[PDB]
C-alpha cells in the first residue's frame, strides 16, 4: 500500500463564524502587517495578520481585527482596487463585493471614521467574478452567468459591454494596468480585451471543459496558469494558442488556481471538498508533482500572501495557513 | 499594423505575402506527395481565375479568386489525354473571359496528344460531350498550347508548328496553320510550313517561350528568332520576325565575358538559350541562359535582354543586363530559375525557384523597384507554380496553395536630399 | 481484383472513362423476399470499376469490390445486369473487349432475417464469390470488323433463347454482335454483323456502290444502343451521328427500319456536332403494357431535346416508334437521364455552367416541353465569413467549416494535413480528435506566421483570415470535388432516388407543402396548380401570396441582419421584440418600396387566417405527457427495420435541411405578421376574426420560432467522440452521488461526425422504432414487418413524431435525457442556457440538469441552489412527477419523505453542514412524526459531536424527548468522550433526571 | 496505458491511506515491499527510526529512484543536517 503526502495546517486561526471567502492583498498597500479580509453571512472582517519571524513579543500568530462589519448576506466575490494603499493617518480602502442579490457593492472605508457602499446594477444571474479594470479603482469589470462582460464606473453606470457566447466566469485586470482585460471562459478559452478599443488583441484557445479558475504569474504576466477539468495548465504568451503545460492538479475537482505572490515558479491548485477533506497542493514549475500537499476538513477560497509564499484557506470556524518555504 | 506574414518571408516586409483568398484542393497535396513536384509535374495559374496541375498522366483543376472573407472555388479531376510522349499541363489551355470568384462562365478547352489529335471541351463542366479534331499532325509530338483571343488556341509542336484551332458555335473545331516566318535573309517563308508536309526554307526552330501580349500581340521567343503575330478572333497575321540567333548572342557574350582577349576562340563554345519572353514597362524582356561548357564548373549566367516593345513591336534597341541569382540551383528534373512578370506595366519582375523568390528589375528600364528576396525555405513550401491573378503576382505552393506578393510596407525615396547636396556642394572659403 | 484483357481500347474518338450506374433489386420490399432496400452501384474510372452493394435499412458487411479491367477502359453505359433464378449475370462492354461475370443470387445465398440485427453480411465474402473464367464468357472482338473509337455505343442482353448477345458499333457503321453460348452449353463464341441487308442481298449488291442495302458507312456508326426481345428475335435501335435511328434484326442480320428523328425536333445544324457523344438514349420496358419506351436526348449546344417513343408491334414481328411526347431541354450537358414507367416520370441530371449541378424531373406525357420541377442540392461551400480588419475571421471560418452539407470529415482531415505539412496522410480520425487537430494545426500555422514585436487587432484578424482561409478553402475545394456528379439511380418499388457524385452517393427526398412553396421561387410556383397547394383555389392564392411576401422579406434581409438576429436572440430577448426591432430597421431602410409590394400582396389575400393556420398546422405536432415512451425495442420483428448507420445519416441530413429552412420560415413569418399588424387588420376580408386571430398567433409564432431555433441549433451542435465505457464510469459516479436519470444505454458511435441530434437519434429513436413501427404500420402501408415501405409518407410521419417528442411545451424531456445519459454536460449547459429564458414547462427539469452539471464540476453552494429550484418543482412539473411518487405518500407526509430521501442524497454528497441545512428546512414538516423529530435532533447532536461543541451537544441531548434515544445518544456521548479523553465534559455536565440513566450506563 | 497507470496510482493511494493512519506497521511493510512502494516504506521506516531497513531498501531500489523521495522527506522534516 501507499500514501502520497498530507499534513496539518502550518497555522490555524479560530473563528466564531464560517469563512466563505478570505483573501490577502494582491499588491502591497504599505503595511508590514498583512491585511486580510474574510466574509460570511453574519460578519465581514478586515484585519492585520502577523506570524512570528522576529521578537519574542510575537508568539506564534498575532491576528488584530482592524474592523468588523455586521453582515446579513453570503459574500460571493470581493476584489480590491489594484491601487493598494494603507500608509496614511486614515487609509482609504476601496473594493467591490458581490452578494446573493445579484448586485454589485462598491465598499469604501476611511479607517475608523466611515464605511460606505454604493448600489451598482448587477447581472441577470449571479456574477461569477469581478475585478477593478483600472489601475486606480474607478472602473469595475464584472462577468457572470449571463455571458456579459459589464464595465461600470464608480457611479454604477454601465460604461461598456462585451458580449459572450457562453457565461463569462472569470475577468482579470492587468495587474500593472495596460487596458488589458483577461477573460477566462468555461470551455477553456482566454480572450484579451483592450479597454480603449473594445476589441480582442489576443486569445488562447482550448477545449478542455470545464475551466474552473486561472491566474497570471504576478512576477510574469506573460505566464498564465489555470485549472481545467482536473488538471493545471500553463501558457506562456504570446507564443501559445493551445496549452503548452498540462499536468494533473488534484485527485479532487480542482476549483481555484492561484499564484504565490513572492515567486515566479510557485502556485497552488485547490481540491474540491466533496465527500473527502479538501486537498491543497502546492506545485512548482518543471516539477509535475506538487511540492506540498495538506488536508483541510473544509476548503472554500484560497489565497496567497501579498509578498510571501503563504497559502490560506478558510472553512468552518477555522482559517488554515500553509507556510511554503524553501 | 502589418498583414499576415509567411514564416520564411517574415523577415521580408518590403513586399507582403497574403493568401489570395484561395488555397489548393486537398487532392492536390495527395497527388503531389504520391508523385513529388521535384519529379516533372506542371502547374499553371490563369489570370482568368483558375489553376491546374498535371502529374504522371492526370490533371487537376480548381478555381482561384481574390477574397474578402474567402470565396467558393470549384475543384475537378481530369484525365490527361493518352498517347502522351511526356505528360504536361502545357498541352491544355483555357480561353477564359472571366475574372470573378465565379469565373467559370467563359471556359473552353483544347488539348492535344503527341499525335496531332485534339480534344475540345465547350466547357469543363459540360461533361458528356467531346470534340475530336484531326489537326494537321499525323503522329507528331505536340508541344504547347497557347490560348488566344476569339476563344481560339495555338497548337505548337516540338519543332514549333503553330496551328490555330478555332471553336465553332456549332461544335466543330477548325485547324488553320499559322504561317511560319518571313525573316530578312533566308529563303521562302510565305509557303505554309507544317510537319507531315512539304518543306520550305523558313526558320522552324523549336519553340522556347510564348507570350500573349494583351496589346494584340502573340510573341514567340525561340533559340533563333522572336515571332510576333496579331491574332484577332478569326484572323492571324505575323507582323514581325526578328532573327535573334546572332545578335543577342554576341551582346550577351559581351555583357558577361567581354573582357577577355580570346573572345573569337572561346565564342564557339558559349551556348546561349533564351529561356523566357516576358514584357514590362520598357518592353519585351528576353530572359536568357548563357554559359560556357568549356570552362568548369558550369555556371549558368542569366541576362535580362530587354527590347522596347511599343505595345506591338520591339525597338531595335537592346539592353542586356547580366544578372546573377545565387550560386545554388534547385531542380524538378531540369535546372530551373524562372522569371515571371505578372503584368505588362509593372516594373517588378520575379525570379523564382523551389526555395526563394527574387523581386527585382531589369536594371535598364524606365523605372525600378527594390531588389528583395522572399524566402519560403521549408518542407511543403516548394513553389509548385507562379503567375498572375486579379492584378497581383500569385504563386502556387506545395502545401499552402495560392499566395500573392503585394507591393507594400516598403521604404520611400525623397527628392529634397539630392537638391540639398547640390546646394551644399558649392561655395568655398579661405583665410 | 484486377482482370487482364489481352487488348485495350482504341483511341481516336470520344473518351470512355468517367462513367457510373446502378441496379435496384426488384426483390426489394418485404422483410423476407430476397432483398430489402438492397441495390448495387458502380463507378468506372477508365480501367478501374468499383462496385458497392448497399441497403438503406441494413448495413451490408464486406459489400465493396474493385474490378480492374486494366486494358480497356469501361465504355460509358456499358455495364448491364440480368437475373436468373440461380445467379446474377453481369455483362460489361469495353472498346475492344466484352466480359460476362457470374455472381451469387441473394436468395441462393439463403434468405432469413428472423434474428433482430442491425448489420448483416453481404453476398461478398471472399474471392470465391466473384469469377471471370471461361474465355467463352470473355471473347475478343475480332479484327473483322472491330470497333471504332469515334462512338460510345454499347449494349448487352440475354436473348429469349438464352444466348449472351453483345451489340457494339461496327466500324463500317453496322452492329457487331458477339454471340456467347447460352447458360446451358459452351461452344465457340460466334460473330454476327448486323448490316443494311442480309447475306444474299449483300452478295447481290457487292458489285455496286451500296451503303443502304450493302455495307454501311462510318456516318451510320452507332452512337447509342437499345434492345428489345420479341419471341426469339433481338431488335436493336441505334442512334447514330447522322440522327437516323436504325433498327437491325438479330436473326435477319439486316436493317429493317431507318427513321429520321429530326422530324420530331427543331432541326438544328448544331445537333450534328453533338451527334458523337452528347446524344443519349435510354430504354425502359413496361411489363404492365408489354411496351418498351425509348427516351432519346438529342443534345445541342443550343438546347437538347428529349423525345419519348413507344414501341408498337405489327403483324410482321416488326416494332415501330410512336411519338408519345417530346420534352424540350437545355444545352446544359447531360450527365445522365432515366425514366421510370411505374410513374411515367423522367429524371435528368445535367451539368450547367456552374457547380450548382442541375437536377430536374418531369413527366413526358403531361406536357409538351415539361415544367421540370426543381431539385435542390446540398449547399456548396460559402464565400464570405468574416473579413479580417473588419471581423474576426477565425470563428466564422470554424463555424462554416463545421457547417454540414458544404464540408466533409475527409476535407477537414486533408486540410489538417495541409496545415501540418509533410508528405504523410491525415485520415481516419475520431471527431473530437479531428476538431482538436483542426484547431492545433491552424494555431501552429498562426504561431509560425507571427513574429511581431507589437500585436494588433488588424494583424490578429489578418493572420486569422489567411490561416483559416487556407484551411477553409482547401476543404471548400475538396467539397467541390465531391460535388462533381457521376450518375443517377431510381428505385420504383420503395421510392427513393440516389445520385452518385464523385465517390459518395446522395439521396433525394420530398418536401412538405410549406417548405416546397418557400424554397421554390415564384416562377415554378405558378407552374404548380392550385389543386395541390391547397384544397381551395382561394386558399392556394392566399398561401402563394404569403410565400411571396416571405420570399421578398428574406431577400430584403441580408447576412448582417441575420447576424443581428442571432446575437439579439442569444442575448436574453423575446423573439417578438427582436422581430419588431428588425421590422423597424427594414422600415427605416425602406426606399425600395419592397414593403409596399409586400403590403399590396397582403391586401391581395382575402383571408390570411386559414393560410397562417395551415402553415402552422403542418408545423404543430405536440404530444404532452410520457407514457408511450419506448427506450428499447419491443421485440416484435419490427426492430429488424431501419436504425442503421446509413439510415441515421440520411435522417440527420434531412433533419438539418428541414430545420435550416423552417427556422428561417418561422423568423420571416413572425416578421411578416408584425408587418401585417402594423399595416392594420381592419382592411381585409374577414377582418372581424382576423384581429383576434393574429393577436393569438403572434406569441405562438414567437414560441415556435424559438423551438425551431433550438432544433436548428441542435442539428449543428456537435457530440464528442468518446468511448462508451468512459461515459459508463461517469454515469456510475453520478449514481454514487445518488443521482437519478443516470441511465446507461449501449449505443454505437460512428467513426465520423457526431452532432447532439445524431447522438439523440442513434441513442433513442432506433429504440423507439417498434412502437413507432407498431403505430405507423397500422396507420399506413402494410402492418406486417414485410411492409412495402411508403417512404414519402414515412418521412412525414417520422418528422411529426420527432416534433412531438421535441416540443418544448410538452413534458417530452427525451433529448436532454439522452444528453445526460451520454454525458454531454457542456452541450446541455448551452442547451439550458438557450431554453430557460422562454421555457414553457419543466423549468425545474432545466434547473435539475443545470445543477447536475454543476455538481459534476464541483460547485457545492450554487449546484445545491439549483437543486433547490429543482425541488421547488419536483411535484409540480409532469416529467419530474413521472420520476417520483416512489418518494411521496406512504406513512409520512410526501414532502417529509422527499426531505428524508434528499437528506440521504446529501449524505451521499458530503458536507454535514448540508445535511444540517436540509434538516433545518424539513423541521417545519417534521411536526407530525416524533420519529422524524428524534432522528433530525439526533443528527444535530451528532454534528455537535463532529465539530466538538460539547456544550452544544449537551443542549441538543437535553432537547431530546425520547428517553430511549436519550440513553442511546448518552452511550454514544460517553464512548466518544472517553476515546477523545474529554473527561471534564462528562463531569461538568449538570444532568438532572438523567442522573439515573447515566448511573446505569 | 499511462492514463490507466497513473489513475490506478492515485486511487490505491487514497484506498490505502486509512490503515496507514491507524498503524499496523509490520503488515504495512510486508505489503508495501511486496508491491514495491518506496515513499510509504520510507516514511514508516523513519517514524520507526529503522535506518537499517532504510539502507536495505535504498540498496534494493537504487535503480528505482528511492533517493529523490529520501531527499524530499528529509527536506519536509527539517533535518537537512
PDB file of C-alpha atoms in Angstrom, chain B residues 196-390:
ATOM      1  CA  UNK B 196       3.786  15.644 -92.404  1.00  0.00           C
ATOM      2  CA  UNK B 197       4.002  18.007 -95.376  1.00  0.00           C
ATOM      3  CA  UNK B 198       6.288  19.752 -97.853  1.00  0.00           C
ATOM      4  CA  UNK B 199       9.348  21.716 -96.757  1.00  0.00           C
ATOM      5  CA  UNK B 200      10.241  25.386 -97.239  1.00  0.00           C
ATOM      6  CA  UNK B 201      13.485  27.280 -96.426  1.00  0.00           C
ATOM      7  CA  UNK B 202      11.995  29.155 -93.471  1.00  0.00           C
ATOM      8  CA  UNK B 203      13.059  29.227 -89.828  1.00  0.00           C
ATOM      9  CA  UNK B 204      11.461  26.365 -87.909  1.00  0.00           C
ATOM     10  CA  UNK B 205      13.488  26.368 -84.702  1.00  0.00           C
ATOM     11  CA  UNK B 206      11.969  24.770 -81.606  1.00  0.00           C
ATOM     12  CA  UNK B 207       9.626  26.913 -79.526  1.00  0.00           C
ATOM     13  CA  UNK B 208      11.260  28.259 -76.352  1.00  0.00           C
ATOM     14  CA  UNK B 209       8.734  30.709 -74.895  1.00  0.00           C
ATOM     15  CA  UNK B 210       5.398  32.310 -75.715  1.00  0.00           C
ATOM     16  CA  UNK B 211       3.645  35.453 -74.526  1.00  0.00           C
ATOM     17  CA  UNK B 212       0.126  36.501 -75.484  1.00  0.00           C
ATOM     18  CA  UNK B 213       0.821  40.200 -75.014  1.00  0.00           C
ATOM     19  CA  UNK B 214      -2.529  41.844 -74.327  1.00  0.00           C
ATOM     20  CA  UNK B 215      -1.674  44.527 -76.843  1.00  0.00           C
ATOM     21  CA  UNK B 216      -2.977  42.261 -79.609  1.00  0.00           C
ATOM     22  CA  UNK B 217       0.427  40.539 -79.800  1.00  0.00           C
ATOM     23  CA  UNK B 218       1.486  36.897 -79.876  1.00  0.00           C
ATOM     24  CA  UNK B 219       5.224  36.725 -79.186  1.00  0.00           C
ATOM     25  CA  UNK B 220       7.172  33.504 -79.568  1.00  0.00           C
ATOM     26  CA  UNK B 221      10.741  33.504 -78.309  1.00  0.00           C
ATOM     27  CA  UNK B 222      12.889  30.792 -79.865  1.00  0.00           C
ATOM     28  CA  UNK B 223      16.575  29.937 -79.799  1.00  0.00           C
ATOM     29  CA  UNK B 224      16.916  31.877 -83.075  1.00  0.00           C
ATOM     30  CA  UNK B 225      14.010  34.320 -83.546  1.00  0.00           C
ATOM     31  CA  UNK B 226      11.160  36.194 -81.903  1.00  0.00           C
ATOM     32  CA  UNK B 227       7.964  35.961 -83.933  1.00  0.00           C
ATOM     33  CA  UNK B 228       5.169  38.472 -83.339  1.00  0.00           C
ATOM     34  CA  UNK B 229       1.645  37.842 -84.615  1.00  0.00           C
ATOM     35  CA  UNK B 230      -1.615  39.687 -84.339  1.00  0.00           C
ATOM     36  CA  UNK B 231      -4.278  37.040 -83.678  1.00  0.00           C
ATOM     37  CA  UNK B 232      -7.765  38.517 -83.932  1.00  0.00           C
ATOM     38  CA  UNK B 233     -10.864  36.433 -83.174  1.00  0.00           C
ATOM     39  CA  UNK B 234     -10.737  34.827 -86.623  1.00  0.00           C
ATOM     40  CA  UNK B 235      -7.527  36.128 -88.239  1.00  0.00           C
ATOM     41  CA  UNK B 236      -3.765  35.684 -87.908  1.00  0.00           C
ATOM     42  CA  UNK B 237      -1.063  37.976 -89.302  1.00  0.00           C
ATOM     43  CA  UNK B 238       2.638  37.726 -88.466  1.00  0.00           C
ATOM     44  CA  UNK B 239       3.626  41.368 -88.053  1.00  0.00           C
ATOM     45  CA  UNK B 240       7.237  40.751 -87.037  1.00  0.00           C
ATOM     46  CA  UNK B 241      10.081  38.230 -87.311  1.00  0.00           C
ATOM     47  CA  UNK B 242      13.284  39.294 -85.545  1.00  0.00           C
ATOM     48  CA  UNK B 243      16.219  36.965 -86.224  1.00  0.00           C
ATOM     49  CA  UNK B 244      17.952  36.932 -82.835  1.00  0.00           C
ATOM     50  CA  UNK B 245      20.171  33.884 -83.432  1.00  0.00           C
ATOM     51  CA  UNK B 246      23.333  36.004 -83.747  1.00  0.00           C
ATOM     52  CA  UNK B 247      22.767  39.478 -82.325  1.00  0.00           C
ATOM     53  CA  UNK B 248      21.666  38.770 -78.759  1.00  0.00           C
ATOM     54  CA  UNK B 249      24.263  36.012 -78.638  1.00  0.00           C
ATOM     55  CA  UNK B 250      27.139  38.441 -79.116  1.00  0.00           C
ATOM     56  CA  UNK B 251      25.551  41.058 -76.855  1.00  0.00           C
ATOM     57  CA  UNK B 252      25.051  38.561 -74.012  1.00  0.00           C
ATOM     58  CA  UNK B 253      28.548  37.147 -74.518  1.00  0.00           C
ATOM     59  CA  UNK B 254      29.993  40.661 -74.265  1.00  0.00           C
ATOM     60  CA  UNK B 255      27.779  41.503 -71.279  1.00  0.00           C
ATOM     61  CA  UNK B 256      29.067  38.502 -69.326  1.00  0.00           C
ATOM     62  CA  UNK B 257      32.584  37.661 -70.548  1.00  0.00           C
ATOM     63  CA  UNK B 258      33.570  40.534 -72.861  1.00  0.00           C
ATOM     64  CA  UNK B 259      36.790  41.390 -71.005  1.00  0.00           C
ATOM     65  CA  UNK B 260      38.942  38.506 -72.243  1.00  0.00           C
ATOM     66  CA  UNK B 261      41.183  38.704 -75.314  1.00  0.00           C
ATOM     67  CA  UNK B 262      40.402  35.188 -76.627  1.00  0.00           C
ATOM     68  CA  UNK B 263      36.798  36.105 -77.484  1.00  0.00           C
ATOM     69  CA  UNK B 264      36.876  34.717 -81.028  1.00  0.00           C
ATOM     70  CA  UNK B 265      38.308  31.356 -79.942  1.00  0.00           C
ATOM     71  CA  UNK B 266      36.017  31.000 -76.920  1.00  0.00           C
ATOM     72  CA  UNK B 267      32.742  32.163 -78.514  1.00  0.00           C
ATOM     73  CA  UNK B 268      32.374  28.867 -80.394  1.00  0.00           C
ATOM     74  CA  UNK B 269      31.658  27.211 -77.047  1.00  0.00           C
ATOM     75  CA  UNK B 270      29.137  29.568 -75.431  1.00  0.00           C
ATOM     76  CA  UNK B 271      25.580  28.282 -75.738  1.00  0.00           C
ATOM     77  CA  UNK B 272      23.001  30.986 -75.024  1.00  0.00           C
ATOM     78  CA  UNK B 273      19.468  29.674 -74.526  1.00  0.00           C
ATOM     79  CA  UNK B 274      16.843  32.392 -74.245  1.00  0.00           C
ATOM     80  CA  UNK B 275      14.586  30.930 -71.567  1.00  0.00           C
ATOM     81  CA  UNK B 276      11.607  33.268 -71.466  1.00  0.00           C
ATOM     82  CA  UNK B 277       9.881  36.125 -73.277  1.00  0.00           C
ATOM     83  CA  UNK B 278       8.255  38.420 -70.715  1.00  0.00           C
ATOM     84  CA  UNK B 279       7.169  42.034 -71.031  1.00  0.00           C
ATOM     85  CA  UNK B 280       7.467  45.029 -68.714  1.00  0.00           C
ATOM     86  CA  UNK B 281       7.210  48.815 -68.927  1.00  0.00           C
ATOM     87  CA  UNK B 282      10.230  49.247 -71.195  1.00  0.00           C
ATOM     88  CA  UNK B 283       9.160  46.382 -73.472  1.00  0.00           C
ATOM     89  CA  UNK B 284       9.828  42.711 -74.175  1.00  0.00           C
ATOM     90  CA  UNK B 285      12.469  41.169 -71.905  1.00  0.00           C
ATOM     91  CA  UNK B 286      14.328  38.124 -73.210  1.00  0.00           C
ATOM     92  CA  UNK B 287      15.368  36.032 -70.209  1.00  0.00           C
ATOM     93  CA  UNK B 288      18.475  34.268 -71.482  1.00  0.00           C
ATOM     94  CA  UNK B 289      20.590  31.379 -70.219  1.00  0.00           C
ATOM     95  CA  UNK B 290      24.205  31.820 -71.315  1.00  0.00           C
ATOM     96  CA  UNK B 291      27.044  29.546 -70.228  1.00  0.00           C
ATOM     97  CA  UNK B 292      30.316  28.055 -71.482  1.00  0.00           C
ATOM     98  CA  UNK B 293      30.766  24.271 -71.038  1.00  0.00           C
ATOM     99  CA  UNK B 294      34.484  24.585 -71.857  1.00  0.00           C
ATOM    100  CA  UNK B 295      35.128  26.367 -68.552  1.00  0.00           C
ATOM    101  CA  UNK B 296      34.216  24.296 -65.500  1.00  0.00           C
ATOM    102  CA  UNK B 297      32.300  24.119 -63.234  1.00  0.00           C
ATOM    103  CA  UNK B 298      29.252  25.015 -65.323  1.00  0.00           C
ATOM    104  CA  UNK B 299      27.865  28.431 -64.362  1.00  0.00           C
ATOM    105  CA  UNK B 300      24.583  29.474 -65.975  1.00  0.00           C
ATOM    106  CA  UNK B 301      24.692  33.263 -66.420  1.00  0.00           C
ATOM    107  CA  UNK B 302      21.263  34.854 -66.816  1.00  0.00           C
ATOM    108  CA  UNK B 303      20.958  38.055 -68.832  1.00  0.00           C
ATOM    109  CA  UNK B 304      17.801  40.149 -68.978  1.00  0.00           C
ATOM    110  CA  UNK B 305      17.622  41.063 -72.668  1.00  0.00           C
ATOM    111  CA  UNK B 306      15.084  43.885 -72.770  1.00  0.00           C
ATOM    112  CA  UNK B 307      13.751  45.087 -76.123  1.00  0.00           C
ATOM    113  CA  UNK B 308      11.403  48.076 -76.066  1.00  0.00           C
ATOM    114  CA  UNK B 309       8.028  46.714 -77.113  1.00  0.00           C
ATOM    115  CA  UNK B 310       5.960  49.788 -78.005  1.00  0.00           C
ATOM    116  CA  UNK B 311       2.797  47.758 -77.404  1.00  0.00           C
ATOM    117  CA  UNK B 312       3.057  45.929 -80.719  1.00  0.00           C
ATOM    118  CA  UNK B 313       6.658  45.966 -81.886  1.00  0.00           C
ATOM    119  CA  UNK B 314      10.003  45.876 -80.089  1.00  0.00           C
ATOM    120  CA  UNK B 315      12.507  48.616 -80.872  1.00  0.00           C
ATOM    121  CA  UNK B 316      15.849  47.782 -82.457  1.00  0.00           C
ATOM    122  CA  UNK B 317      17.487  48.987 -79.219  1.00  0.00           C
ATOM    123  CA  UNK B 318      18.523  46.093 -76.974  1.00  0.00           C
ATOM    124  CA  UNK B 319      19.616  46.268 -73.336  1.00  0.00           C
ATOM    125  CA  UNK B 320      21.302  43.132 -71.988  1.00  0.00           C
ATOM    126  CA  UNK B 321      21.789  43.276 -68.224  1.00  0.00           C
ATOM    127  CA  UNK B 322      23.893  40.390 -66.915  1.00  0.00           C
ATOM    128  CA  UNK B 323      22.072  39.324 -63.753  1.00  0.00           C
ATOM    129  CA  UNK B 324      23.009  36.598 -61.277  1.00  0.00           C
ATOM    130  CA  UNK B 325      20.860  34.903 -58.614  1.00  0.00           C
ATOM    131  CA  UNK B 326      22.947  32.936 -56.084  1.00  0.00           C
ATOM    132  CA  UNK B 327      25.396  30.112 -56.865  1.00  0.00           C
ATOM    133  CA  UNK B 328      22.963  27.318 -55.954  1.00  0.00           C
ATOM    134  CA  UNK B 329      20.322  25.761 -58.208  1.00  0.00           C
ATOM    135  CA  UNK B 330      17.198  23.759 -57.440  1.00  0.00           C
ATOM    136  CA  UNK B 331      15.534  21.346 -59.835  1.00  0.00           C
ATOM    137  CA  UNK B 332      12.429  19.310 -60.593  1.00  0.00           C
ATOM    138  CA  UNK B 333      14.194  17.365 -63.344  1.00  0.00           C
ATOM    139  CA  UNK B 334      15.677  20.387 -65.151  1.00  0.00           C
ATOM    140  CA  UNK B 335      17.872  23.229 -63.911  1.00  0.00           C
ATOM    141  CA  UNK B 336      15.274  25.899 -63.176  1.00  0.00           C
ATOM    142  CA  UNK B 337      15.232  29.561 -62.196  1.00  0.00           C
ATOM    143  CA  UNK B 338      12.300  31.257 -63.877  1.00  0.00           C
ATOM    144  CA  UNK B 339      11.424  34.927 -64.333  1.00  0.00           C
ATOM    145  CA  UNK B 340       7.750  35.928 -64.394  1.00  0.00           C
ATOM    146  CA  UNK B 341       6.425  39.434 -64.980  1.00  0.00           C
ATOM    147  CA  UNK B 342       2.846  39.382 -63.624  1.00  0.00           C
ATOM    148  CA  UNK B 343       1.753  42.493 -65.514  1.00  0.00           C
ATOM    149  CA  UNK B 344       2.840  44.337 -68.659  1.00  0.00           C
ATOM    150  CA  UNK B 345       3.112  47.695 -66.851  1.00  0.00           C
ATOM    151  CA  UNK B 346       4.709  46.630 -63.556  1.00  0.00           C
ATOM    152  CA  UNK B 347       8.451  47.191 -63.161  1.00  0.00           C
ATOM    153  CA  UNK B 348       8.886  44.315 -60.707  1.00  0.00           C
ATOM    154  CA  UNK B 349       9.965  41.011 -62.245  1.00  0.00           C
ATOM    155  CA  UNK B 350      10.047  37.910 -60.044  1.00  0.00           C
ATOM    156  CA  UNK B 351      12.715  35.296 -60.432  1.00  0.00           C
ATOM    157  CA  UNK B 352      11.650  32.190 -58.559  1.00  0.00           C
ATOM    158  CA  UNK B 353      12.948  28.743 -57.631  1.00  0.00           C
ATOM    159  CA  UNK B 354      11.938  25.896 -55.317  1.00  0.00           C
ATOM    160  CA  UNK B 355      13.020  27.871 -52.234  1.00  0.00           C
ATOM    161  CA  UNK B 356      13.178  31.640 -52.883  1.00  0.00           C
ATOM    162  CA  UNK B 357      11.515  34.368 -54.916  1.00  0.00           C
ATOM    163  CA  UNK B 358      13.545  37.391 -56.033  1.00  0.00           C
ATOM    164  CA  UNK B 359      11.617  40.515 -56.937  1.00  0.00           C
ATOM    165  CA  UNK B 360      13.894  42.850 -58.876  1.00  0.00           C
ATOM    166  CA  UNK B 361      14.131  44.862 -62.084  1.00  0.00           C
ATOM    167  CA  UNK B 362      15.987  44.556 -65.374  1.00  0.00           C
ATOM    168  CA  UNK B 363      18.345  47.360 -64.384  1.00  0.00           C
ATOM    169  CA  UNK B 364      17.919  49.219 -67.683  1.00  0.00           C
ATOM    170  CA  UNK B 365      14.213  50.043 -67.679  1.00  0.00           C
ATOM    171  CA  UNK B 366      12.330  53.320 -67.293  1.00  0.00           C
ATOM    172  CA  UNK B 367      11.930  52.879 -63.511  1.00  0.00           C
ATOM    173  CA  UNK B 368      12.810  50.420 -60.740  1.00  0.00           C
ATOM    174  CA  UNK B 369      11.552  48.640 -57.629  1.00  0.00           C
ATOM    175  CA  UNK B 370      13.582  47.344 -54.660  1.00  0.00           C
ATOM    176  CA  UNK B 371      15.576  44.127 -55.134  1.00  0.00           C
ATOM    177  CA  UNK B 372      14.246  41.840 -52.397  1.00  0.00           C
ATOM    178  CA  UNK B 373      14.245  38.096 -51.784  1.00  0.00           C
ATOM    179  CA  UNK B 374      11.121  36.429 -50.389  1.00  0.00           C
ATOM    180  CA  UNK B 375      12.128  33.059 -48.899  1.00  0.00           C
ATOM    181  CA  UNK B 376       9.907  30.030 -48.441  1.00  0.00           C
ATOM    182  CA  UNK B 377      12.564  27.651 -47.137  1.00  0.00           C
ATOM    183  CA  UNK B 378      10.572  24.709 -45.765  1.00  0.00           C
ATOM    184  CA  UNK B 379       9.068  21.274 -46.484  1.00  0.00           C
ATOM    185  CA  UNK B 380       5.785  21.630 -48.306  1.00  0.00           C
ATOM    186  CA  UNK B 381       6.702  25.226 -49.207  1.00  0.00           C
ATOM    187  CA  UNK B 382       8.327  24.467 -52.575  1.00  0.00           C
ATOM    188  CA  UNK B 383       6.982  26.722 -55.323  1.00  0.00           C
ATOM    189  CA  UNK B 384       4.822  24.470 -57.485  1.00  0.00           C
ATOM    190  CA  UNK B 385       3.964  27.345 -59.836  1.00  0.00           C
ATOM    191  CA  UNK B 386       3.722  31.085 -60.353  1.00  0.00           C
ATOM    192  CA  UNK B 387       1.595  33.537 -62.302  1.00  0.00           C
ATOM    193  CA  UNK B 388      -0.785  36.479 -62.039  1.00  0.00           C
ATOM    194  CA  UNK B 389      -4.414  36.763 -60.945  1.00  0.00           C
ATOM    195  CA  UNK B 390      -6.521  39.911 -60.449  1.00  0.00           C
TER     196      UNK B 390
END
